[PDB]
Amino acid sequence: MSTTLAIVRLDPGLPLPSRAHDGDAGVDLYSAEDVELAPGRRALVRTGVAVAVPFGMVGLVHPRSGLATRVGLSIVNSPGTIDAGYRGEIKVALINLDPAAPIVVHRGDRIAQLLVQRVELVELVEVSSFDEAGLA
Amino acid sequence: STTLAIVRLDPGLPLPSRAHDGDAGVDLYSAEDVELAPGRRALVRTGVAVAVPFGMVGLVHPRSGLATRVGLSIVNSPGTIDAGYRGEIKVALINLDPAAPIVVHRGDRIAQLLVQRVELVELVEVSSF
Amino acid sequence: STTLAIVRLDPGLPLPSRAHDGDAGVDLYSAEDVELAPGRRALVRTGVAVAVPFGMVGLVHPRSGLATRVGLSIVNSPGTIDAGYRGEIKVALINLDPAAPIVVHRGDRIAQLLVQRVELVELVEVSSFDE
Ligand SMILES: O=c1ccn([C@H]2C[C@H](O)[C@@H](COP(=O)(O)O)O2)c(=O)[nH]1
Ligand SMILES: O=c1ccn([C@H]2C[C@H](O)[C@@H](COP(=O)(O)O)O2)c(=O)[nH]1
Ligand SMILES: O=c1ccn([C@H]2C[C@H](O)[C@@H](COP(=O)(O)O)O2)c(=O)[nH]1
Ligand SMILES: [Mg+2]
Ligand SMILES: [Mg+2]
Ligand SMILES: [Mg+2]
Incomplete structure (x- = not known):
């Protein structure tokens, strides 16, 4: 039993992301734009949405496994990390x-x-060494 | 204390195992010989299928030694195995x-x-932030 | 509310810190000067070691700004830091x-x-799945 995820369609022309099957880990995000990527080239592509990840959670952007195999599409910064305070696109x-x-x-x-x-959201505690801290 | 049910589709590979008690992952084996030229990819069978419980997700991560040593990566890392998937x-x-x-x-x-x-969040469309 | 023991192997780098209260990660610093020629990789020291608690995992992710602006990535992304790891x-x-x-x-x-x-799932072999 989970919570909701508030989402804004910055681009009202795209479908709302949705969970294709009940247990599926992710919802698909769409491209708001047409773009061609030549071999080895990248682009930063707008998805037309913004979300409010709950405090204590993280949003994670993963590549689609099909296009990965079929044509080699990937994400430079996978997994993309969407922090709880981020409200941008x-x-x-x-x-x-x-x-x-x-x-x-x-x-x-x-x-x-x-x-x-x-x-x-760990509190980091500096220790002089694992030995001195009893953490071998 | 959660169980992951697993099928050895290839009975000639060892069962994946957790090498030390708190290690996050279990290593998956290749069921095939493959040779990858610079910049080339392949979809390689592991010989196993799993039953990720509802409320969970399976994550396929690259190994660090091979990554540094020979440049071995995974195109769709982290590879996402949904709770409904029962294939290889x-x-x-x-x-x-x-x-x-x-x-x-x-x-x-x-x-x-x-x-x-x-x-398993329920998306709710709202006007703005 | 967990804590994370960290050692500064390199004392001349700032301790990683969480920039804003709910941010998912703490940024890790390079201990080294490296130039990466196009397509090339390197194993870069961060100057820290941690004790990931039992029942948890540490995960090393790329930074998103550098990913786009220059194509900097991580080959084993997401890097997996096991609970029993005490190295750098x-x-x-x-x-x-x-x-x-x-x-x-x-x-x-x-x-x-x-x-x-x-x-920390216990793998249990079955003959088949229930259809
Ligand atoms: O590394 C991976 C990633 C995914 N899959 C399988 C299991 C997923 O549930 C399904 C994903 O298909 P997509 O909807 O992401 O394309 O494919 C794999 O076998 N290996
Ligand atoms: O795939 C991604 C990854 C990150 N960000 C946004 C949300 C983050 O919280 C913010 C800052 O990124 P960094 O500087 O931490 O890497 O950028 C995205 O839009 N897409
Ligand atoms: O980004 C990383 C990933 C791993 N390791 C170390 C910690 C792991 O516990 C150990 C084993 O590597 P793997 O084969 O599990 O990925 O290597 C790192 O220093 N940095
Ligand atoms: Mg899917
Ligand atoms: Mg290991
Ligand atoms: Mg940050």
């Missing part, structure tokens, strides 16, 4: 890892998936 | 080295599998 | 740009460290 750093074939992304194509998990 | 775990291996091919043989440890809780 | 955290940086080098300085923020719970 989610943008995805796509990259074409194929050596030869460009990748054409159309507005409205699914380009990544977004997960939400709890994160432990 | 396949690893989208890639050679990020510019010049040296990567050899993988059957039986090699090619990735690690983590299981975590996931928050 | 090292980051496997890789310049995924086709043409421009990346200069990394000592003191630059080069990755972030998240700590999450992990399910």
